[PDB]
């Protein structure tokens, strides 16, 4: 059934699984019309489909053209997400197909289940975890490729850069969730922390700065401090 703190290690076993997050699929700016009414203007979105074991990200860019002339876009977005995930699984060779897909939002379960009826051996699961994958659009290079897209496009990334050379998936996923939780809670502070020291660069083929092991400990500490402060302010405690 549901993925939670109890079964957290299952993410890093040898069963291929994907997380699917649909929180950035349908994105709008709300604005005033000339007549003083409110209208939305969609901007480009993305499906965030992540192998938590390998760090492989299947970033399907959702171009604003997919919403042209469509009604009930927040509902369509869930079905569009399920159609694209289904398309992705069918495009993979059998031995690369996930055995499980975990949706970050429960509203994705029925749309994905219906789109995956051809795959009765692929388990579709919710999670009780509050995963910060919505902050994926706070990663500059992911945001950049989404906003520049002029057509539907799949872009492949390793969201762990080269980390798996030095750390386990479990540790790489904890670092990722800590960076995304920080970016989600206070984007300005989190981005300040990551770039401040100018000697530390992002390699052309990476998303995050090239930090030594010791520089990562310092960065991770600064991210936890950011998250606890903001939590104090949120709840005056």
């Amino acid at each position: 059934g549901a993925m939670n703190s109890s079964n957290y290690a299952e993410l890093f076993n040898n069963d291929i699984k994907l997380f699917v997050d649909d929180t950035n699929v349908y994105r709008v700016t709300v604005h005033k019309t000339f007549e003083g009414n409110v209208a939305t203007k969609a901007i480009n979105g993305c499906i965030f489909t992540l192998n938590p074991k390998t760090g492989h990200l299947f970033l399907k860019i959702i171009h604003t053209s997919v919403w042209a002339g469509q009604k009930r876009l927040s509902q369509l977005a869930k079905w569009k997400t399920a159609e694209e995930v289904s398309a992705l699984v069918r495009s993979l060779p059998k031995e690369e197909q996930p055995k499980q897909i975990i949706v970050t939002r429960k509203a994705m379960l029925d749309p994905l289940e219906v789109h995956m009826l051809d795959f009765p051996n692929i388990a579709i699961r919710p999670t009780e975890l509050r995963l910060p994958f919505s902050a994926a659009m706070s990663i500059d290079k992911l945001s950049d490729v989404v906003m520049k897209a002029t057509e539907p496009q799949m872009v492949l990334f390793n969201i762990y850069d080269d980390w798996l050379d030095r750390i386990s998936s479990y540790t790489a996923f904890s670092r990722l969730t800590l960076l995304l939780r920080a970016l989600k809670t206070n984007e300005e502070s989190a981005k300040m922390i990551l770039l401040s020291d100018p000697t530390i660069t992002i390699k052309s083929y990476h998303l995050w700065p090239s930090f030594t092991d010791e520089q990562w400990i310092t960065i991770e500490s600064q991210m936890r401090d950011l998250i606890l402060t903001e939590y104090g302010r949120k709840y005056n405690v």
Partner: protein, 300 residues
């Protein structure tokens, strides 16, 4: 007006005949039920005083043969049997009627309740849902599972209701996933009505039979089937107007007849709230919505 004579009543039992019921004492001189209206199916049902577990009974049509009940002290139940000897039968019933040993099917002249509950139910369709082809009558009880229930364990003793599953390839055309899931008209009209039932009369017959098995035997799988067939129509944007009108009448009489104290287990909150207040047909069931609101406002 036909008769279902009884050999005897050796055990104390509540006897049902359609929507009516009588208490019979152990060894009470009871020899059956007379004046049963010709032209409808009927159900004769039983709850032992000693074991309020297992309600059970027999769907039958008096036009199809001469049926009697005899207690079997080995299997411990009242069994329906057919008497092929027409003149032995008439002679037994004549004696029992002369000795006034038979209760009279107690139909009020003005009262169309049974007709309204059984309008589309035919013995020939019952016998395909309940397979025991050597008998003209169909046994049902509280415990019998449905073919669908068995898929999720004795095939012979199953209720072979039409499988309905909203998250099945049968229900969802490839490339019409969102359309077919959110609007089940394809599944209702093409797969079920034209494909499997052939017409709305057969669909309604199965729906009505599922309700009566739910109500008279507390058959849980029957109740699931009744709700599934209601929900498939209510979740369809495109339903013939005559089907919507007739559904409103069917459901009205089902809700009218339901014992007030069984609404908690026999009515699915989600299905009814969805059918009356959210669905495509939320405004197509005036009679059903008014009786549900006035009789079961808590469920909603």
């Amino acid at each position: 007006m036909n008769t279902v004579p009884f050999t005897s009543a050796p055990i104390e039992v509540t006897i049902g005949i359609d929507q009516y019921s009588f208490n019979v004492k152990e060894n009470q001189p009871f020899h059956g039920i007379k004046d049963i209206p010709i032209g409808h199916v009927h159900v004769i049902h039983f709850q032992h005083a000693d074991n309020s577990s297992m309600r059970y009974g027999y769907w039958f049509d008096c036009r199809m043969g001469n049926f009697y009940i005899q207690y079997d002290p080995k299997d411990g139940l009242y069994k329906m049997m057919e008497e092929r000897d027409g003149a032995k039968f008439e002679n037994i019933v004549h004696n029992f009627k002369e000795r006034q040993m038979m209760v009279s099917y107690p139909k009020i002249d003005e009262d169309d309740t049974w007709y309204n509950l059984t309008e589309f139910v035919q013995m020939d369709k019952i016998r395909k849902i309940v397979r025991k082809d050597e008998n003209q009558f169909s046994y049902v009880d509280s415990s019998m599972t449905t073919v669908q229930e068995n898929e999720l364990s004795d095939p012979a003793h199953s209720l072979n209701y039409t499988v309905i599953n909203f998250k099945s390839r049968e229900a969802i055309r490839p490339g019409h996933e969102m359309e077919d899931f959110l609007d089940k008209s394809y599944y209702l009209n093409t797969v079920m009505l034209q494909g499997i039932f052939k017409n709305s009369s057969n669909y309604f017959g199965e729906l009505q039979f599922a309700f009566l098995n739910a109500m008279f035997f507390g058959n849980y799988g029957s109740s699931l089937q009744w709700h599934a067939m209601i929900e498939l129509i209510c979740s369809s944007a495109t339903v013939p107007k005559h089907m919507l009108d007739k559904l409103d009448e069917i459901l009205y009489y089902q809700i009218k007849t339901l014992p007030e104290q069984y609404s908690d287990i026999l009515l699915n909150e989600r299905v009814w709230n969805i059918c009356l207040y959210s669905s495509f047909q939320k405004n197509s069931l005036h009679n059903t919505e008014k009786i549900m609101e006035n009789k079961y406002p808590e469920l909603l």
